[PDB]
Amino acid sequence: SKLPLLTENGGRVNRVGFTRIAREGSIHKFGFFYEFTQESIDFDSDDGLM
Amino acid sequence: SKLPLLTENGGRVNRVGFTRIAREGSIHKFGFFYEFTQESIDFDSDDGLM
C-alpha cells in the first residue's frame, strides 16, 4: 500500500523525516582510611607491619 | 494406441504441428523527497546533520 510513486514531471508527492536521541552518564566518589599510633609500631613484636 | 506405424505403401499418414507462446514484462517508477529550512540548518546544535 505504501509504495512511493511518481510520473515524468513530479512535484510534492512523498515526504520523510528524521529523529535523534541522546544518552547520559555520571560520576561518583569513594574513599576510606585508617589510623595508628607511634607506640604501636615501635613496640610491636613484628617488623614491617606497615 | 497412438504409435506412428508405417506401411509398405504409405503416404499422407502421420502429420504433426508445432506451437509457440510469448511472455511480457513492464517497468514502473518510484521516488520521494524531503524538505528543510534555513533556520533549522543554522541554529541546530549539531553541525553536519545534512
* Structure resolution, Å: 4.0
Half-sphere exposure of B22 (CA within 13 A, CB side): 2
DSSP string spanning A19-50?
-------------------HHHHHH-SSTT--
Closest CB to B33: pick one of A3, A14, A20: A14
All residues of chain B having their beta carbon less than 8 Å from the beta carbon of residue A5 are 28-31
The coordinates were experimentally obtained by: cryo-EM
Distance CA A38, CA A40 (A): 5
At A15 the three-state DSSP class reads: strand
Residue A5 near residue B32 (C-beta atoms within 8 A): no
Q: Does B31 contact A6 at a Cβ distance shorter than 8 Å?
A: yes
Closest CB to B30: pick one of A5, A15, A17: A5
C-alpha cell belonging to residue A32: 576510606
Amino acid at position A35, single letter: E
Contacts of B7 (CB under 8 A, 6+ apart): B13
DSSP string spanning B4-15?
----TT--S---
